[PDB]
């Protein structure tokens, strides 16, 4: 995460990394939606360009982390029963980013517990300006020890479709401070599949409101990172669920 | 179904150093 922080310790318990078999690789981030359901963005599994095709068997998770140190009593492994992509998942603007990976249970505990899922929520906290967190074990620059945080304001759509030239669909939403907003901020490489959270003022709990895509190089001026809009989405993630 | 509720945290009634930015923004 460029501009980042170091995060607190259980400052993100739903905070899940995402590692290959073998070769033994840290390919992204997810979340702990439930004690048996991990969520993640699509292009972490399947991107046919770069003959990405990983199955259950090739994956594995590791929950409660706090640095890539063995958290000895505190870190959790599992490995996953079946994976589950969006069937209309546009690989060729990763429109609808996002899959299911399901696991055994893993035992919640101070620095394991699941993140919840927007409900009709989203009407108040999808607003540009509203702030959000990201974290994430990804590329400090675009060219870390401890999980990195960052909380970035929602940008609204016009500013959003201006600032690239992909096809930007309602099943996504940009996030970053503007080239004249003072602060900077923003995902990277290695983040795919982070959470981007917010903290409802109504029942004092944190809501996945989004995940982590896409974004044209990393904290550039005139550049927002693009995360995949999980209310729109949850009606299927409730199908499968 | 206490999802959210972050048990070093909310739990303890305790909030993390950058939370208030966010709500904040809420207004
Ligand atoms: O997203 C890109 C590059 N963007 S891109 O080439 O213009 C292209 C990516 C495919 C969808 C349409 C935009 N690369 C990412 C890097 C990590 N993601 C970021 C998130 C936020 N901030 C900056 C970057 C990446 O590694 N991917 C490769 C596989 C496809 C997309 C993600």
């Known amino acids: 995460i460029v501009e980042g922080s170091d995060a607190e310790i259980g400052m993100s318990p739903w905070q899940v990394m995402l590692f290959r078999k073998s070769p033994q690789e840290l390919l992204c981030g997810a979340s702990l939606i439930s004690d048996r359901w991990v969520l993640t963005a699509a292009h972490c599994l399947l991107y046919p360009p770069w003959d990405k095709n990983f199955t259950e068997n090739d994956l594995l998770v590791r929950i409660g982390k706090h640095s890539r140190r063995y958290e000895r009593n505190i870190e959790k492994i599992s490995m996953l ?18 899959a299911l990976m399901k696991l055994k249970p893993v035992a919640f505990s101070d620095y394991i517990h699941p993140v919840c899922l927007p409900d009709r929520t989203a009407a108040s906290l999808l607003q540009a300006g509203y702030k959000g967190r990201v974290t994430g074990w990804g590329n400090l620059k675009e060219t870390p020890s401890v999980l990195q945080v960052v909380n970035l ?9 201006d600032s690239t030239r992909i096809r930007i669909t309602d099943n996504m939403f940009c996030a970053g401070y503007k080239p004249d907003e003072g602060k900077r901020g923003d995902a990277c490489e290695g983040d ?21 895509s896409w974004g044209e190089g990393c904290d550039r001026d005139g550049k927002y990172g693009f995360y995949t809009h999980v209310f729109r989405l949850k009606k299927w993630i409730q199908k499968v669920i | 179904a206490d999802c959210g509720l972050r048990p070093l945290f909310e739990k303890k009634s305790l909030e993390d150093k950058t939370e208030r930015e966010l709500l904040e923004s809420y207004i």
């Open chain 1, 153 to 161: 304001p929602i940008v609204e759509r016009p500013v959003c479709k």
């Open chain 1, 81 to 98: 029963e079946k994976i589950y992509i969006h069937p209309r998942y546009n690989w060729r603007n990763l429109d609808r980013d996002i």
């Open chain 1, 192 to 212: 795919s599949g982070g959470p981007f959270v917010m903290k409802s003022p109504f029942n004092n709990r944190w809501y996945q409101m989004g995940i982590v």
